[PDB]
Amino acid sequence: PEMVRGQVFDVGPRYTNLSYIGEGAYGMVCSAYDNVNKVRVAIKKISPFEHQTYCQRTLREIKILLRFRHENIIGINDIIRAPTIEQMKDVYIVQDLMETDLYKLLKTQHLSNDHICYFLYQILRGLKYIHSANVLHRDLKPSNLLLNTTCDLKICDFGLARVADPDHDHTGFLTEYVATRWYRAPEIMLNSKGYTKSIDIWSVGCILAEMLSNRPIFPGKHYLDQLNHILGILGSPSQEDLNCIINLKARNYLLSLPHKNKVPWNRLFPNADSKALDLLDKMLTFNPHKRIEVEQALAHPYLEQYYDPSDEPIAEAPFPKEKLKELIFEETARFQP
């Protein structure tokens, strides 16, 4: 049984020669040599079984990633676990190894306009498929966009994903939320549970802005500071957009703020392609009803060199800790001999 950083890796003998990569609240990640398909692979040790929310997230991802098949969405190649529930303490998810992610890339590299266009194309192409399955990713951010040495992009981390539920999207003002702060749509802080496809388009808009300057566009330091940053650039909402917020606490908060003028995109991004900034504007629309949809974004002039709806496929099949351990056990059975 190989060891890495105070953790066993029961992955062998198929997978050998491990090197550490990263870790989190309930898992660790290594590269490894796969002896059957003769390549290095990524492996994620997940240890969720003590906690119901980690169980929920592990199960969501497995179920989604096994149903999905798309060039721009990370797949699962293998799952390794003990042969019985009783002996199962960890799950290892095997996936294609990717050179880097967009978070690491943006911290070190200037992107050409051609790179930005191609990355945005692939994000939206993957997202078209995700949304066509009635799924919302709900945590799109640069670190969840993996890249290989030829700049092919795959969306990962479906642990916060939900089935879309637009009729049950409304909530009160300043209702707590789980997804990453800098990529949260303004409506999350006002009146939305993040159950609509528009939540994901806002995150893509933020990612686009961050590709243009190598800096997050809305770097809030805490829940309501996030709205502060958004309004600092978009300006005060229009009368019509306020009228769509019927919740009085959310409405009256916005009414309380001094007038702020829109910062023009071409002032924030003086070297950007004008067509990129037109698409940016449409993704970072304050009102989610007016916000561009994935399929319209793909059809936008900025992406004209790539747009091809016949090669932008859709999904064929849209969608306690003790029982969730069993469902994880059931869902991973197909990888056993």
Ligand X SMILES: O=C(CN1Cc2ccc(-c3nc(NC4CCOCC4)ncc3Cl)cc2C1=O)N1CCc2ccccc2CC1
Site for ligand X in 297-326 (CB under 6 A): none
How far is CA 268 from its chain centroid? Answer: 25
Q: How far is the CB of 101 from ligand X (least distance, A)?
A: 4
Q: What one-letter code names the amino acid at 17?
A: N
Site for ligand X in 249-278 (CB under 6 A): none
Integer-rounded Cα radius of gyration of the chain: 21
Site for ligand X in 51-80 (CB under 6 A): 74
Identify the residue among 8, 20, 22, 336 touching ligand X (CB under 6 A): 22
Whether 139 is catalytic: yes
**Is 126 assigned a ligand-binding role in the annotation?**
no
21 binds ligand X (CB under 6 A): yes
23 binds ligand X (CB under 6 A): yes
Q: Are 237 and 286 in contact (CB under 8 A)?
A: yes
Q: What one-letter code names the amino acid at 334?
A: R
98 binds ligand X (CB under 6 A): yes
Q: What one-letter code names the amino acid at 305?
A: Q
Identify the residue among 27, 205, 216, 288 touching ligand X (CB under 6 A): 27
Catalytic residue among 139, 157, 200, 241: 139
**What span, in angstroms and rounded, lies between the C-alpha atoms of 135 and 150?**
28
Taken in order 330, 92, 55, 189, the sign of the CA dihedral is negative
Q: How far is the CB of 31 from ligand X (least distance, A)?
A: 7
100 binds ligand X (CB under 6 A): yes
Identify the residue among 8, 19, 20, 104 touching ligand X (CB under 6 A): 104
* Token pair in block for residue 197: 């496809």
**Is 21 assigned a ligand-binding role in the annotation?**
yes
**What span, in angstroms and rounded, lies between the C-alpha atoms of 232 and 212?**
18
Q: In what order do the strands lie in the sheet with 39-46?
A: 15-24, 27-34, 39-46, 91-96, 78-80
**Is 24 assigned a ligand-binding role in the annotation?**
yes
Identify the residue among 34, 90, 157, 241 touching ligand X (CB under 6 A): 157
174 binds ligand X (CB under 6 A): no
Burial state string for 229-266 with b = 16 or more CB within 10 A and e = fewer than 16: bbbebbebbeeebbebbeeeebbebbeeeeeeeeeebe
* Token pair in block for residue 293: 């949809």
**Is 27 assigned a ligand-binding role in the annotation?**
yes
95 binds ligand X (CB under 6 A): yes
Binding residues: 21-29, 44
Name the residues that contact ligand X, by CB under 6 A: 21-24, 26-27, 29, 42, 44, 46, 74, 95, 97-98, 100-101, 104, 146, 156-157, 159
Binding residues for ATP: 21-29, 44
Catalytic residues, which ones? 139
